Design a binder for this molecule. Structure first.
Ligand code: HEC
Ligand code: HEC
Ligand code: HEC
Ligand code: CL
Ligand code: CL
Ligand code: CO
Ligand code: MG
Ligand code: MG
Ligand code: MG
Ligand code: MG
Ligand code: MG
Ligand code: MG
Lengths: 106, 106, 106
């Protein structure tokens, strides 16, 4: 999928996690987020279209999604363990990674 | 290892999982598949032999193995947490990821 | 952070794990190691500075940190279930992955 569609999937499911009441909604949303994060790694964002494909900026872009995926992993295991509020608090901390990438590359 | 040997590792251990009897075989097989998936990221497939290692097809290729590794991760936790049958089911669903990369780059 | 600081974070936290008393200390140190491994993957090491950013060496360097991160994952899960000695032994085996990269790119 396009980068913006993957971003839509990340944002829509973050909202689902924040509003969620049970572990099933959270786990389902985090699984969708992981898939969108990895697929976004394949994209070149418009602001880096003037960069080499292995420039430090594109490596930084791609590793940002590895960092997001590992944060999603921690939240997803908490959701699996039934720790709904902890899984939601971990999903809130995802936003630092969202924001940091946007600051550099949106 | 080179790409073909990692692919044999993937194929052989997928068969071990399909024909497994105990959790130890499945856990051991999935850990070997993850290792092989990550090692395969270092390779250049013959159909991309001449392209540049940072071309979008090479990025798509390498991210295919992150996706495979994360799907292996879910199956390995199913094996580690008991559910041998559901791990084998998840291992079987990996073939969709195997096949999607093969359609493009094999 | 730069590569050398991330390397000292890896080494310091491996020391912390070796002298830890309880699982919380081991888990917290492994998460710091995971953060540093991913941040170091963004770096260009001195030995490859005069190579193409898209060189096969640079890809091999970055995949090494994926392999480290996934080994840290298994150690971290041992710590989460409270298996202190088992987590410490797995942390100790990380040194094989540390050294394998150093042999090539130190
Ligand atoms: C880089 C490593 C990023 C991470 C991590 C996240 N996002 Fe992102 N996002 C990124 C870029 C480069 C862009 C620009 C897109 C464009 O082509 O215009 C975006 C965009 C968004 C958007 C707006 C999409 C649109 O409608 O145009 C949203 C809503 C968004 N991103 C959300 C989002 C969330 C919720 C994230 C973490 C959970 C997140 N992004 C991470 C790059 C990166
Ligand atoms: C891309 C991201 C791939 C994923 C995921 C999987 N495979 Fe693959 N495989 C890929 C390529 C480019 C090739 C061709 C290699 C070559 O040198 O021709 C292959 C090949 C195989 C083979 C045949 C190996 C041979 O000796 O010719 C097998 C048996 C194989 N692959 C199995 C396999 C399995 C079981 C996978 C998922 C669990 C899988 N592959 C994923 C690229 C990619
Ligand atoms: C490649 C994939 C590596 C892995 C995995 C690990 N290290 Fe490393 N290390 C690497 C390089 C290229 C370098 C040289 C960096 C430089 O700028 O000089 C290093 C260096 C170190 C150091 C010294 C850092 C310094 O102060 O200059 C330490 C203490 C170190 N590495 C430790 C370490 C540990 C404990 C690792 C595994 C847990 C590990 N490294 C992995 C490349 C790679
Ligand atoms: Cl790359
Ligand atoms: Cl990568
Ligand atoms: Co896990
Ligand atoms: Mg489009
Ligand atoms: Mg759209
Ligand atoms: Mg679209
Ligand atoms: Mg000092
Ligand atoms: Mg010291
Ligand atoms: Mg010191």
């Amino acid at each position: 999928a396009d980068l913006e569609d993957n971003m839509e999937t990340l944002n829509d499911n973050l909202k689902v996690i924040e509003k969620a009441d049970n572990a099933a909604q959270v786990k389902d949303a985090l699984k969708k987020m992981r898939k969108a994060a990895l697929d976004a790694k394949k994209a070149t964002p418009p602001k880096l279209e003037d960069k080499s494909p292995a420039s430090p900026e594109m490596i930084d872009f791609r590793v940002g999604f590895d960092e997001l995926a590992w944060e999603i992993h921690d939240a997803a295991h908490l959701a699996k363990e039934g720790k709904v509020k902890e899984a939601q608090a971990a999903a809130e901390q995802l936003k630092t990674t969202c924001n940091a990438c946007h600051q550099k590359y949106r």
